[PDB]
């Protein structure tokens, strides 16, 4: 049975960073590394398992996460580093065994006046535990005075929408990220 890789890579509409998408991969024979030849992905770094003998191995289980980041945050999708993307939106464990893929989507997720449909968390009260998703749009309490649900002085909205005009530098360009994690179980994925 072929794997539905086009349902994740070639999906019509894509998730934000604070609300990253998810897709479970099982019961298929998967053609890894044939994607490596395609020129769209500007990053195909893999950890623990070399990206060449992927086809010669089988894993009990595979996890796929799809989201959209900007520019100078592709280096943030990796183990062992800090920052607004890594500490508040998506954190990776130090003992990561999988791959990281990202490609440019200039003509899809960017418009001249700005595509404000992509969000990311910039406020948080604690760091992001490895492999955690934060969806709460509750107002962050920055000072001693309680926010009480009204956003104003020392009371700011936790999310900020990516500005994202195509006329800006590619350090702000769309970069659709696809993360695969590799873990009994049946034949699983091979």
């Amino acid at each position, epitope marked *: 049975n072929l794997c539905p890789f086009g349902e994740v890579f070639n*999906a*019509t*509409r894509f998730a934000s960073v604070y609300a990253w998408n998810r897709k479970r991969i099982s019961n298929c024979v998967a053609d890894y590394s044939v994607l490596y030849n395609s020129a769209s992905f500007s990053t195909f770094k893999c950890y623990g398992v070399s990206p060449t003998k992927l086809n010669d191995l089988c894993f009990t289980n595979v996890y796929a996460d799809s989201f959209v980041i900007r520019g100078d945050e592709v280096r943030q999708i990796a183990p062992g580093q800090t920052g607004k993307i890594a500490d508040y939106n998506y954190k990776l464990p130090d003992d990561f065994t999988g791959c990281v893929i990202a490609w440019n989507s200039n003509n899809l997720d960017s418009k001249v006046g700005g595509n404000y449909n992509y969000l990311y968390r910039l406020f948080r009260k604690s760091n992001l535990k490895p492999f955690e998703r934060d*969806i*709460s749009t509750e107002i962050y309490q920055a000072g001693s005075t309680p926010c009480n649900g009204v956003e104003g002085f020392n009371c700011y909205f936790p999310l900020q929408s990516y500005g994202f005009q195509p006329t800006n530098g590619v350090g702000y360009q769309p970069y659709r990220v696809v993360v695969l994690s590799f873990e009994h179980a049946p034949a699983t994925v091979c």
Partner: antibody, heavy 124, light 110 residues
Framework: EVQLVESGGGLVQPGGSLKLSCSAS????????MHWVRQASGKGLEWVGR??????????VYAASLKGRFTISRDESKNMAYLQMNSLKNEDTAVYYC???????????????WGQGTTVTIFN | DIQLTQSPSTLSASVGDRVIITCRAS??????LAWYQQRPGQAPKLLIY???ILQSGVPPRFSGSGSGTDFTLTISRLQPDDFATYYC???????????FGGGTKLEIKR
């Protein structure tokens, strides 16, 4: 401070129609999948259906027993989820719960936010 | 379709005893199983997910295990607030229906 409020339940003649609304508060309902679960009086939990995220194009699956009578919809403008029911009969007299559980979508960690339930009663 | 059977339907125990609850499936579901608890007139709380991992905030006395078709919920130490009904649920695919268990009403012994 994440809540889930439902409404719309009431007396319904058999074979009529009713629409329920699960309103999300404190978070955007369009990002995560939404589950509908019902339970009759003194009976066990009965899974109704599920709507997916906006990213997954709002996929709908329903139980076999609810063949062609139930439809799940949502409204991103009002941050609410809908439950459509046709051809009502005594199996449907139950307390219906709206819940958002991100773990059943094969995630790792999440939160179990539930609603208060809306009693739907079918009378002749 | 997959039907879940909970055994037993009800049992009685005092405070501080170890209690086992079994949830058997028709077809092998791998590890997609969740456990719930429901107090009277109350919304169910999520307890165990993926059959082994604890939810944030529930006390450590709860423990779950199992794989394939046999699954177990264990309370190492019973307490007055844990005496309610429990349900098991399987995820097992994004395209086929999801099902609950028959329930296991846990009552006190006096």
């Amino acid at each position: 401070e994440v809540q889930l409020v439902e409404s719309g339940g009431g007396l319904v003649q058999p074979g009529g129609s009713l629409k329920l609304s699960c309103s999300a508060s404190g978070f955007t309902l369009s990002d995560s999948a939404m589950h509908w679960v019902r339970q009759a009086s003194g009976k066990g939990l009965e899974w109704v259906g599920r709507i997916s995220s906006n990213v997954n194009n709002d996929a709908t699956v329903y139980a076999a027993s609810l063949k062609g009578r139930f439809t799940i919809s949502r409204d991103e403008s009002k941050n609410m989820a809908y439950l459509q029911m046709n051809s009502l009969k005594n199996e449907d007299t139950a307390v219906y719960y709206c819940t958002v559980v991100p773990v059943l979508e094969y995630y790792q960690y999440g939160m179990d936010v539930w609603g208060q339930g809306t009693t739907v009663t079918i009378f002749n | 379709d997959i039907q879940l059977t909970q055994s037993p339907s009800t049992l009685s125990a005092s405070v501080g005893d170890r209690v086992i609850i079994t949830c058997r499936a028709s077809q092998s579901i791998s590890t997609w199983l969740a456990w719930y608890q429901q107090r009277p007139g109350q919304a169910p709380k999520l307890l165990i997910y993926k059959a082994s991992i604890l939810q944030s905030g529930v006390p450590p006395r709860f423990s779950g295990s199992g794989s394939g078709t046999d699954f177990t919920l264990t309370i190492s130490r019973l307490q007055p607030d844990d005496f309610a009904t429990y349900y098991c649920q399987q995820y097992d695919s994004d395209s086929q229906p999801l099902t609950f268990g028959g329930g296991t009403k846990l009552e006190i012994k006096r």
